[PDB]
Write a protein that binds this ligand. Structure first.
Ligand code: HEC
Ligand code: HEC
Ligand code: HEC
Ligand code: HEC
Ligand code: HEC
Ligand code: HEC
Ligand code: HEC
Ligand code: HEC
Ligand code: HEC
Ligand code: HEC
Ligand code: HEC
Ligand code: HEC
Ligand code: HEC
Ligand code: HEC
Ligand SMILES: O=S([O-])[O-]
Ligand SMILES: O=S([O-])[O-]
Ligand SMILES: [Ca+2]
Ligand SMILES: [Ca+2]
Ligand SMILES: [Co+2]
Ligand SMILES: [Co+2]
Ligand SMILES: [Co+2]
Ligand SMILES: [Co+2]
Ligand SMILES: [Co+2]
Lengths: 519, 519, 259
């Protein structure tokens, strides 16, 4: 078993760690729990690392003293439908194949499931690695603890001998790139420079061969993503978040300057060979909006194209690791500020944004957010125990499972059935609007080939392409966002109605132009 | 009540029956349980039947001594959604109406329900008899025991005075023909020659007036379909199965020669007037894959057309009673070996196969099949009794109802929730691919009229018709097959990805040709 | 918070502990979790204790690293009928009043309930302290966690000004004595010589005024009754059990020599 190391001896070189360690709730916790540094200590200097110490990045490294949190972390909600495709009449976006066209998400876009699986599902989804990585067995799909212990215990590589991205199954894509992994794992936290910049000290960067990167990575949503392992203090580690909030001065709540004062990120930079290498953002309070917003946001983590000139924007460019940090109504402008779009629709020829789970930016300005509610209040409350220390659950999930804690504690005039009914009322209403936005956008899209083939002018096409951008944005936001309007029902409603209005305008212009063209 | 007959007196003429009867577990069971042969005995010769003895073909004939099995046989799973149409966003094939076009299945293709109803549902489905046969009352839909006792106790004929197939309701078809009945009933087992050939001794054949045939038939999935009534030994009786396995030497497991040695059918032929009339296939072991594969397979039981010359293939031809006996990847070649296709798609003009429930041929080569699992292991296990003789259940149904017996006995590291989750993971994943295969195939189909009307060449159309055959096959297999991928998830995945690839190729060729044509 | 102490400094005078500590699964666990020894360290020599260091005996001292086991330890089984008298047709011994006569158990012998309550129940049962100690409230009967955290947070002394064993209610007995406590708590583990012999180093002994001893005791069935806190290894601490196994020569399984 473990033998404690002489922390003082570490502290002589590791002065920032000493400052954080000696003062927090891990003061008595020895380095050997998370680091094997014997050869390091024998070989390091004040400036050279010497032999690289091992850092244990498994969530299980925390389990020896925080079993309750680890067990909850690893737990699996079976009722979260697994590997359920959204392009599906039983799911979020029945017309998705028309709307997203040749985009990578057309190869597969499943609904989310439990956190334990995030890195595995990233590796094995059909859009990510050409089908290179597969569960070793269909039995393994249930194994949340296994996944937490390491992806490669439950999945395997169809060709360990090659590192190129290619299709191993016909209907897959190779959309993954190294930026993705930042929202699946932070095993690479010491191997990745801030933003994924190429860096002397970084094994991995935005431009790495993702298949090689993938093989170096094991655990989902590491515990230290939200808790500093040295001081225990709440933090974020996600580079693009710290970039938005601190570097670009946008604030933790970019729409609330007073709240951004009350909730803060304090950057801490770590160097390698005396140059800035990595950063964390220490939270002044444990605001889970920011912890969860490391991932549950709209982002670029993919190549794209410039709005100005159509030029590709490849992984070398920092824009491929970017948090827009903007609500649905400000998003188009935020994408313009970085001169960026994701894809050209294969049918309409319209430059389009690709929207991914903007839960936090939807949550901003909602009644609940305005009243200081955070994600964890509804998705990751404390357990309730008649006779025990009530720790925080650590696998976030629908409040439906825990309504007394999630809703009924603040809404005590309501029964569980009532609080669910209120949920369903909003989701149903919103879902309805998403289906209509789909109907109209699909109708618009489907009219494009008719227009083109009828000889409708580029001028008209171009005007409908401009409409498509907003029609798309104000639709996809909502199939991307996983609350089906619950997080911000009035915003979902305005925005989806805007999508519809844009689409109907687009359809009207195409219909008129086709009509004139044919006559 | 019954008076036993002198079996010895029967045995003098019935030497094959004697051999089977005296040696098995029915040695003490008198003929009068299943036959009323008094006038027969008085009138028969060594060669002429004389007066025809009555054979009791009701499953209830077995109930006097096998109540437990009969009751289970007659039971109704209420949770199997009844008369649920597959061409339906809530079911298997939302785009089915586009994909199947004018095919008979477009009038109705409901999901399966409990075995007790199979003959009734065959009679009354909208595609079968033009709506001629109807439940006497909508109350009767629940009556599984009634159906087992005789179809005509719960259903009725809208016009007993005529025997022609015609529509009694506007949106029905008259797809039924006599071959169908072989997978619904074997009441006609002594009235139908092997293969349904016209025969002096057969009242009924492939070419009979199906409405007259229908009225002669009463009970579903007769007990003796899987058990020889004389010896009790496991068997099959379905002619096209015995044809594939024995006559054509394909083996019980055509993809496993060693397994086909270990599991065997021994033909037994019965003559009439000294010529071969009917056959059964005695199983050496009670392998329910073969018992269930009498019906849960892909087959021809319908007229079609020749691939070579488009000529009709009518009921007179043996190909209209055929088991393809091939997996999805070998099916196209197997249909070519018999120079056959089912229908021309009304929109595309493509010759197409029509696929029906290929559960067994999907099951072949699956992990479970490879490990010697059989259908009944998951769908028809033994009951579990703390204090009773544990007989086999006899109404097959989803293992979800009986997970401890179906899954958890072999998978003891799993909870019920886990084993269901693994099921759902595969069905969800597969369903997703079926929806995309539908999207693409429908898009291909819908483009055909645009191509044709734009003046695209027959050469291009013909090339997309060739793609349609495979696009169709690798789609319909999976909406036809009722496990939604569970029976062979890797095969479903490869095949559905092939369907998609073919469709996308088809769409690409039509788009290019239309574009060139218009310019 | 806690600031670790230099354990190597401790080892300089605590070889017996070092030998247990450095070898086991608590090698990395600092003494400060369970001891306050700052003044001890300032004043001690190898031959002189100096200031007595504090030893934290709360099961909650272990909950910062073993919350799951602690929470389970504190849990209450509501189905275990509480305060159910055995001399009772609904219980174990309907004729117990005749059978036991004037024995102290005649004043109350309830069925056992959850471990969390064992010290509390010992203090408040009618046969033990003459009704001296009582739940502060009948509401307190549910509070397993409060009981684990300290008996005196949920129960109270009817007369803190006197130490004598006497009846406070007419049908009570004063059967409690210091030996009882050994099966309720080991808070007194450093204050009680083996067997409860009078001893210069022992505050408490078999012959102590049980009411004063009661007041010094807080936690039920301490985590360290079964687990050595320094090595983590399984152990027993109960003197009479060691005495039976070792001193009486009976072995761990007196009816099975091989075992
Ligand atoms: C024992 C050797 C531990 C290891 C391994 C880990 N933690 Fe820990 N942690 C430990 C103690 C004794 C405490 C203090 C308990 C107390 O409340 O006094 C903690 C505290 C934390 C906290 C909470 C801080 C708070 O504000 O309440 C967190 C968030 C925490 N520890 C996180 C954590 C992580 C992520 C770990 C793996 C990297 C981890 N701990 C390991 C003891 C030990
Ligand atoms: C943080 C800003 C993320 C980045 C970078 C990537 N993903 Fe992601 N992903 C994120 C969240 C919050 C969720 C749950 C919400 C949702 O839309 O499902 C996901 C989900 C996935 C999943 C599972 C569901 C699915 O789409 O099938 C997969 C397979 C996945 N993400 C893959 C993936 C890829 C390939 C990425 C780089 C191109 C990528 N993710 C980046 C958060 C973030
Ligand atoms: C961000 C998505 C987190 C992940 C990753 C981990 N934890 Fe966490 N933890 C998180 C929150 C929002 C809270 C509540 C904070 C508050 O003040 O309300 C916690 C709390 C803890 C604690 C403190 C005791 C408790 O409330 O349970 C500990 C010891 C802790 N977390 C440990 C821990 C472990 C071991 C993790 C990996 C298994 C882990 N956390 C990840 C948010 C997040
Ligand atoms: C990046 C490391 C993330 C952090 C931080 C948070 N979430 Fe997450 N979440 C993430 C992904 C990639 C997924 C998809 C996982 C998959 O394999 O499909 C999810 C999923 C969820 C869900 C759905 C859970 C379910 O049962 O379906 C919820 C409700 C959720 N996430 C909420 C959530 C909360 C509240 C967070 C802060 C406490 C949080 N997540 C952080 C990625 C990441
Ligand atoms: C309470 C007012 C909530 C707040 C705070 C957050 N979410 Fe939420 N979320 C809530 C509901 C009622 C639902 C619908 C769930 C249902 O069972 O119908 C959701 C949904 C999600 C999901 C998808 C979960 C699922 O359907 O299984 C995710 C991934 C999610 N929410 C994330 C999330 C984030 C990241 C939050 C902070 C930005 C957040 N939620 C807050 C209710 C509430
Ligand atoms: C009583 C007069 C019976 C009639 C009518 C039927 N069966 Fe029978 N069966 C009967 C007996 C006494 C036995 C032997 C019981 C034993 O285990 O010794 C059987 C056996 C069977 C078997 C099982 C053979 C085996 O391998 O275990 C089967 C499959 C069977 N019987 C089928 C069956 C059918 C389909 C019937 C209606 C046609 C039928 N039995 C009627 C007694 C009687
Ligand atoms: C054995 C090779 C069969 C032949 C010949 C016929 N059917 Fe069938 N049928 C078979 C199975 C294994 C099933 C269940 C699987 C499924 O696809 O549902 C069925 C089902 C039916 C049903 C009920 C569901 C429905 O389609 O509405 C009907 C009404 C039905 N079959 C009718 C039918 C007709 C009209 C046939 C001759 C054209 C026919 N069946 C033949 C197995 C077999
Ligand atoms: C094929 C689809 C079958 C139908 C039709 C009938 N039975 Fe069956 N039966 C079948 C199997 C797969 C088994 C188990 C065989 C094995 O060795 O595991 C059975 C078993 C019986 C038995 C034996 C006792 C038992 O296991 O229950 C009997 C007596 C029996 N079956 C009778 C029976 C009756 C009365 C039927 C019509 C109501 C009937 N079987 C139909 C498969 C099939
Ligand atoms: C021809 C006589 C069949 C035999 C032999 C087997 N099956 Fe069957 N099955 C058949 C039909 C025509 C149907 C459709 C019935 C209807 O009226 O819709 C079915 C249905 C099933 C089902 C679905 C049951 C439900 O609850 O929905 C299952 C699971 C099934 N069949 C399995 C099965 C098994 C395991 C068999 C061998 C033991 C078997 N069937 C034989 C036709 C016939
Ligand atoms: C265990 C490994 C199975 C084997 C062996 C067989 N089937 Fe199956 N089947 C299985 C599952 C998990 C499902 C999905 C059912 C669910 O509830 O999700 C099915 C489905 C069917 C069905 C449709 C039943 C329904 O959804 O109600 C049929 C008609 C069917 N399976 C037939 C069947 C045949 C004929 C088998 C031998 C060739 C066979 N199954 C084996 C699991 C298993
Ligand atoms: C809680 C997990 C502990 C830690 C860490 C340390 N000690 Fe301990 N110690 C603990 C208890 C509960 C007791 C009471 C006796 C028992 O066996 O349970 C003790 C006792 C001591 C003693 C007295 C031993 C004796 O002579 O009777 C000493 C000298 C002692 N402990 C020293 C000590 C040192 C130096 C530690 C850091 C290495 C240390 N303890 C850690 C509980 C716990
Ligand atoms: C963190 C600062 C701890 C304190 C306070 C306590 N324990 Fe502990 N314990 C801790 C660790 C890091 C470990 C090793 C876990 C591992 O994965 O190896 C342990 C282990 C135990 C064990 C079991 C050892 C085994 O055989 O597996 C026991 C029985 C144990 N700890 C008991 C215990 C007690 C009774 C405590 C209060 C006096 C206590 N621990 C405090 C971390 C910490
Ligand atoms: C002395 C410190 C004890 C140790 C060591 C163990 N037990 Fe115990 N147990 C003890 C008491 C004084 C009581 C009565 C508590 C009360 O307040 O009434 C108990 C009770 C039990 C029970 C009953 C719990 C219930 O739900 O009623 C059981 C089942 C029990 N004890 C079992 C048990 C086991 C298995 C032990 C070793 C792990 C154990 N006890 C140790 C005193 C003490
Ligand atoms: C260990 C050898 C013990 C001695 C010394 C004492 N008690 Fe005890 N007690 C012990 C156990 C294992 C149990 C549970 C089994 C049972 O008979 O209940 C108990 C229980 C109690 C209780 C609760 C039930 C009851 O009698 O009301 C009380 C109130 C109690 N014990 C008091 C008590 C007294 C007064 C003691 C000294 C005279 C005493 N206990 C010693 C284990 C042991
Ligand atoms: O692709 S991820 O952002 O769901
Ligand atoms: O039509 S039958 O084969 O379902
Ligand atoms: Ca995006
Ligand atoms: Ca067919
Ligand atoms: Co779902
Ligand atoms: Co998504
Ligand atoms: Co249904
Ligand atoms: Co069907
Ligand atoms: Co009781």
């Amino acid at each position: 078993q473990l033998k404690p190391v002489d922390a003082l001896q570490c502290y002589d070189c590791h002065t920032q760690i000493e400052d954080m360690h000696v003062v927090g709730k891990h003061a008595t916790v020895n380095c050997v729990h998370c680091h094997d540094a014997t050869e390091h200590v024998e070989t390091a200097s004040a400036r050279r690392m010497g032999e690289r110490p091992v850092t244990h990045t498994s969530p299980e490294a925390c389990a020896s003293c925080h079993t309750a949190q680890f067990n909850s972390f690893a737990s699996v909600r079976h009722e979260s439908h697994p590997r359920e495709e959204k392009a599906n009449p039983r799911s979020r976006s029945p017309k998705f194949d028309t709307l997203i066209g040749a985009h990578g998400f057309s190869l597969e876009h499943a609904e989310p499931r439990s956190h334990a699986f995030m890195l595995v599902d990233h590796f094995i989804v059909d859009r990510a690695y050409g089908g290179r990585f597969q569960y070793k067995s269909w039995q393994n799909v249930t194994d949340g603890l296994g996944a937490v212990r390491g992806a490669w215990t439950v999945i395997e590589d169809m060709d360990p001998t090659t590192s190129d991205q290619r299709r191993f199954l016909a209907q897959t894509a190779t959309a993954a790139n190294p930026v993705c992994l930042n929202c699946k794992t932070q095993d690479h936290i010491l191997d990745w420079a801030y933003m994924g910049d190429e860096h002397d000290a970084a094994k991995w960067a935005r431009t790495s061969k993702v298949v090689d990167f993938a093989r170096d990575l094991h655990h989902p949503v590491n515990c230290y993503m939200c808790h500093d392992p040295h001081s225990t203090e709440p933090r974020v580690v996600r580079d693009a978040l710290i970039h938005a909030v601190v570097d670009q001065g946008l604030g933790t709540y970019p729409y609330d300057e007073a709240k951004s004062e009350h909730v803060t990120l304090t950057p801490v930079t770590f160097q390698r060979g005396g140059e800035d290498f990595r950063k964390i953002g220490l939270l002044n309070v444990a605001d889970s909006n920011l912890m969860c917003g490391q991932c549950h946001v709209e982002y670029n983590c993919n190549p794209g194209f410039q709005q100005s000139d159509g030029a590709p924007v490849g992984m070398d460019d920092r824009r491929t690791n970017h948090f827009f940090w903007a609500n649905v109504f400000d998003y188009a402008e935020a994408a313009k500020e970085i001169d960026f779009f994701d894809f050209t629709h294969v049918t309409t020829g319209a430059p389009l944004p690709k929207l991914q789970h903007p839960e936090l930016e939807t949550f901003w300005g909602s009644t609940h957010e305005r009243n200081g509610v955070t994600c964890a209040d509804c998705h990751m409350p404390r357990v309730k125990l008649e006779n025990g220390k009530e720790y925080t659950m650590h696998s976030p999930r629908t409040p439906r499972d825990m309504m007394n804690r999630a809703c009924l504690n603040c809404h005590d005039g309501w029964t569980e059935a009532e609080a669910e009914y209120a949920i369903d009322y909003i989701k149903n209403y919103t879902h309805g609007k998403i289906m209509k936005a789909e109907f109209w956008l699909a109708r618009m899209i489907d009219l494009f080939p008719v227009a083109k083939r009828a000889g409708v002018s580029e001028d008209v096409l171009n005007e409908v392409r401009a409409l498509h951008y907003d029609a798309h944005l104000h639709w996809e936001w909502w199939t991307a966002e996983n609350s089906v309007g619950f997080h911000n029902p009035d915003q979902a409603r305005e925005s989806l109605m805007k999508s519809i209005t844009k689409s109907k305008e687009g359809v009207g212009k195409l219909d008129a132009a086709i009509d004139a063209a044919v006559a």
